[PDB]
Design a protein around this ligand. Sequence first.
Ligand code: CL
Ligand code: CL
Ligand code: ZN
Lengths: 6, 108
Amino acid sequence: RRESAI
Amino acid sequence: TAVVQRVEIHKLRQGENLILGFSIGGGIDQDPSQNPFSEDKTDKGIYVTRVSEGGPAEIAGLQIGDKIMQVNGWDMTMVTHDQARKRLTKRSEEVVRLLVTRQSLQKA
Ligand SMILES: [Cl-]
Ligand SMILES: [Cl-]
Ligand SMILES: [Zn+2]
């Protein structure tokens, strides 16, 4: 599962 | 069941970067079955997978496992991963007003 840190 | 709440996060201006202090997972372009926070394993919505300690989001109330319904008016239930990523990183907005839902707990 992709994951973005913002 | 699940309760609905709104979180307002003021981004952190680190030099030329704007930080929110949290991570996301989900989106229609992703496999919803690999989501531990959703009761329904078909739900491809956006979820908070991480919340940095002492970060803006943590101080604002964001909690891991929270499902992002909408951001600053824009809907977040039927978007792709990149879309949600772009709607949370719009440089012209110093603040993001999140509408989320979370397993209310207190549900013994
Ligand atoms: Cl948390
Ligand atoms: Cl809003
Ligand atoms: Zn601010």
